[model samples]
Target chain A: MFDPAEKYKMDHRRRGIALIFNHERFFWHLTLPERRGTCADRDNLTRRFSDLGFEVKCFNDLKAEELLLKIHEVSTVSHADADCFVCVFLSHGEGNHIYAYDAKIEIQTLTGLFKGDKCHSLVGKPKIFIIQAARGNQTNITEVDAASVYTLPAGADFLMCYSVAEGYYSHRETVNGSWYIQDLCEMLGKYGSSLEFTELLTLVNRKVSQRRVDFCKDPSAIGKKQVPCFASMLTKKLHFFPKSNENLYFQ
Target chain B: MFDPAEKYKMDHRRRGIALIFNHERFFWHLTLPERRGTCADRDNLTRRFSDLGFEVKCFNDLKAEELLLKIHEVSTVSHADADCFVCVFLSHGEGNHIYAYDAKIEIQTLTGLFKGDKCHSLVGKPKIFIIQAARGNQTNITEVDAASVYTLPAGADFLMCYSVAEGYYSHRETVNGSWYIQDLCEMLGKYGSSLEFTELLTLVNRKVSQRRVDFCKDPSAIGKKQVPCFASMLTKKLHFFPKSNENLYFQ
Candidate 1:
């Protein structure tokens, strides 16, 4: 089949900025264990998102205040020409917020930092948040790729991709990485150029869902089920065009 | 029926502070619409929580950082003798945040502020965050009570109550107030003195989940289903005693 992305093109660099917040540890006294495999999540996202032509920026183990400041900074700086903004959060989390090294930051505050009023440079462009944490209640442990994307303002072309259903466990291996992220990378590599954003995500959800309840082995720990959740208020179809493909428009 | 809470009361004050962030209007130019029926959510909560023996403090239409600073201030101040802490949020929310008059704050930041490590005086007590918002891609307009609770670290006894599931619509009649809050306040009045917190929430869930999917009665607006979601990391059961019942401990 002919590649559809090559046929339709944008005038500028079609891929945009990608921001990653990877938290592996908590404050010193927090009895909660470190998120051991987050390095894998970060490394894979950095390389893969960069290769996709996104200008990738990454932060590690931010305290609550620092995380807010960084996000505020990003929203303030110019993004006048970027087609979209992608924010990825990898951490131990409960409902509605991601954990900082020592505290929690609301997912909405981070996303809302880029609303049309605050982040003027990126208004009307898609703002995507990829969260990997439990959708509600901790204590279930940060067991798998049970990720979430928080609510940003409406009418602002935001798409949130969460790793699992609200309050369900997902799968992630200490060395193999999270089930959702691994599948996302695989799907993007296989179909990123050919599919729209929602289509690509649906494929990721399917691939991740099919993996064996393999990670947890005990009755409670093993063989549990899972699926990813995606929410969109996107008014348009989004296809990522690599920079090289931009030249095709002129051709 | 004999009250179990009366048998175990050594408490000076049965319950602690109830902080309510009520946003009836969005900052103009936010492009975000106002939240109708918020006054009802607020007034009902103020009267009800106060009647429930909580020292209620309410703020109307805060900006984002102001909300955060206030929560941080609460978390930092001493609360060594209070039984539990309840933070009520009524606003336009997306993902994991409560919107200020013109801004949004992460739910996580608010909850985490009260964690054992951060808010040392309130450690081991229940930290409850009542969130009402859409989980993903917030464009449905200020809809209904689908409520939510943010996740804090484990072992700190966090309970989250969400009005709806991950990505669905819920209802709030302009004149009648939100379905979730109405159900919740009614349930608490009926069972709060006698039942444990979880048991009370279960009753509220059953009640709200069964309401007529009543808002926006048009073809797309009419008759959809929604169920509230609940999560807990509580190490103990909770019972709210009326002032009259507290004297029963001595009898």
Candidate 2:
């Protein structure tokens, strides 16, 4: 087993990164009008992460390669100064892949860049990825009843928060806004620092589930479930902001 | 499409079920005798659910067949008076299957009992299950790290919360107690009435994740990650204890 003291000592080190990507315009989908609703959602999340002292970046209209490049760039910096990294992707997707402008990128490709050995800088820090995209061609609208939340340890935290579960259509209201993003922003805005990461996600789930049922009735769509996947490699507890503010750089 | 008006009407209904199962005196073959401490973890969970207002039933030391019978008995009660049914299983397991004394029962078998058509009384209501057991054979000796707090919506209202993710050993500490149960109780105790269900769960996740690493390690085993799972099936917003004092019964 790894030394517990060593792990605790490492927890005080500094490094933090937050990346937000929303591919509003992909090359293959030119006719698809841009939905400006989720923009607020992204901005809200960016602000929340920034408030927690992370260097936040929001990228729009980027191709697959560009997105990858941006990830490397952001990760490189985060690896240097912070103890953890967070990435959020909002775009279109197939079952297992996310779409860039003209190409598609597997979720693994993005996360693979930050693996312990590959990215020596971010070796043991927590890395989180929040992906908001539809997984398949189904759009059966259904009502959401309740939301659930989760928490994680410090290390490389890769959280893929999808708008809907695999093979389900995520709903958007021209009036109320995108179900997942709107709820997410509301929850984060209300409880970012006060609540744990998992708590925030649970509230987001409740909001989305409650508000997304109006769109689940398209005869051609199959009803699908929405669940967020949280994968972690950390060995100690991590907080976005520590109770004591001794070191501004470390949490 | 399901009637929106009906959905709106249903949204105002206050309904839920909470089942608390405790498997004491039953230890897994792979688990060490020293690790088999008191059943306080399960007992604590039962009290938490009971406090939530469901007619809680605490089942203990039942054989495989008796376990099923107890479930059937609870189903009958839930079927008679609640819109949702919650079944909490605390036991030993090898994977998806949970053991009842000397025999093994698949998790699905219990959850399957509440399917819509089969259990007409709970057809449209949310059926929630909280399973607290090891889903795998391995356990971790090293201290686990904290997790982030985030939320998501499940099917309309039917949701399930698993103590740990699939293929991960659920840890228990005789001194510090079960990580999952502790966090769960803390959140529920502090915010049960004021916050949404998902919000509470998220807080639980955070508490569990942020808990001191020293208190989280299971020295007796290896290879375990304790994460929770949420599955839902309701079609409208469900506030466990709604503001309006209306009672929505299942039967």
Candidate 3:
């Protein structure tokens, strides 16, 4: 017999905060180019998460320190009545750190604040981190014979979804948004209340892989490929079940 | 409206090869201590995979070049009739490389050989890698602020299972094998043919986390914790269904 306890508890009074750290422009010294279409990605995620009954908040262009403080503040708050938590990053990344305006921030430091020991109120609850950053170039150097590559951070109840694989380019359109975030938003809208979350992510993976960089001015990227991948340590099936009428009325 | 095609095709004419790369001792110059109980791990996995209907082969203490050559040979062979492929590594590790007998090999290089573009015969089939290695010390420095941790290698239809989280110690018994492998083998025996593979891995995570270092000689190692984690790019459910009598007769 299938057990209901096998799935996450999705009926808390609050769906929790969906924190969006949108970094469109890096500092001049970083030499990294501006991320043009990230606002659209941020907007799409904001609308989609709001539809799923989350309290969405977007923070644009924070420095590394500010970004850490903001996330730390959220992690320390009482999530007792909340079901789960989410954090999304829209920026440029290299090696193992993502850009935050003036400097780079380690992904683990941002996530470790919510680990079981630090965030006791939300222990055993899902802590979802959706990242939209380019970790490498289109040349895919890490796949070469001698190049050493890294592994994902280890923690239970965490699901880290990457817009592209390690050492591969992620595609973004100037007019729209990233191929991964766009397709992910579409899947969330279509099946946010109906399908299993990981299953929905699998659908987004297929939709993004089938898409080509059709409108790029750079000939090197015009027909290039992209495939979104996720590292999950989730212990149970996750479904963002629709909010009940009584819970909605409380808000 | 359930679709069976969402599952991987596991009912092929043969259950594919499960290659075990067992490294017990390293070169003296490397200054790494001998892995005391890896052979028990190798033997246990060999028995479990064989019982699950795989062609299990064990390779003992191959140098880096020879290890690469052996995998290349297998990846190039026609897996047209095989259901899937699995490679297991039992060795010492640091950073992004796992130690062979004489040298350290990049993990991506091993897995990249079986990508869809490289191994056409095994395209769309599951390419699972199970690694038992110590990536870092007991202090867990990677969890500290400003440390850049690595992300998992990305590709479709691949699953990477680690015996311990990155930057954490992996516990071993001089006679009883590793905590992760022991729990993993027990789970496989209990539900290899019945439960989905990722679900079974989640159970392993719980089992390994609940275990304490009950028999450690070093007091600092005693009462320390370990958690097993996996990174999945699998697009569908994987079940090693029991073989039919017709398929069994051919073996």
User: Cα-based RMSD of the predictions, in order?
Assistant: 17.9, 9.5, 5.3
Task: Name the better of 1 and 2 by DockQ.
Answer: 2
For model 3 chain A, the run of ten residues with the poorest summed lDDT: A140-149
Off by over 4 Å in 3: A1-5, A135-151, A213-218, A247-250, B1-5, B135-151, B213-217, B247-251
The number of the candidate with the highest TM-score is 3
Q: How would you encode candidate 2's per-residue C-alpha lDDT over A1-251 as one tens digit per residue?
A: 42221222223455366788876555644333344455655777777777666768788878767888888776565365455677887766654567676777777667777766478777646666776665323132232312111222222333445565422346544444466766677666566656545445555655554443334454433343443433333334345554244745454
Ordering by DockQ: 3, 2, 1
lDDT of 3 by residue, A171-214 (tens): 77765877788899998888888886777777776676667557
Query: What TM-score, computed on C-alpha atoms, does each candidate reach?
Result: 0.48, 0.56, 0.88
Q: Which sequence of candidate numbers ranks them by lDDT, best first? A: 3, 1, 2
Query: Which segments of model 1 are wrong by more than 4 Å?
Result: A1-10, A135-155, A214-216, A245-251, B1-251
Candidate 3 Cα deviation (angstroms), residue A143: 22
Evaluated on CA atoms against the true complex, candidate 1 attains a DockQ of: 0.02
Q: lDDT, candidate 1, residue B198?
A: 55
Candidate lDDT values, in order = 0.64, 0.54, 0.77
TM-score of chain A of 3: 0.89
lDDT tens digits by residue: candidate 1, B1-251: 31112222316445689998887777767666566777787887787788778888999887887888788888888887677888887766665566787676776667768866688877656777766654322323335433343322222356666665543455665665667788888867776667556556655655664566456535565655555544444434566766655344421
- The model with the greater lDDT, 2 or 3, is 3
Chain B, per-candidate TM-score: 0.83, 0.72, 0.89
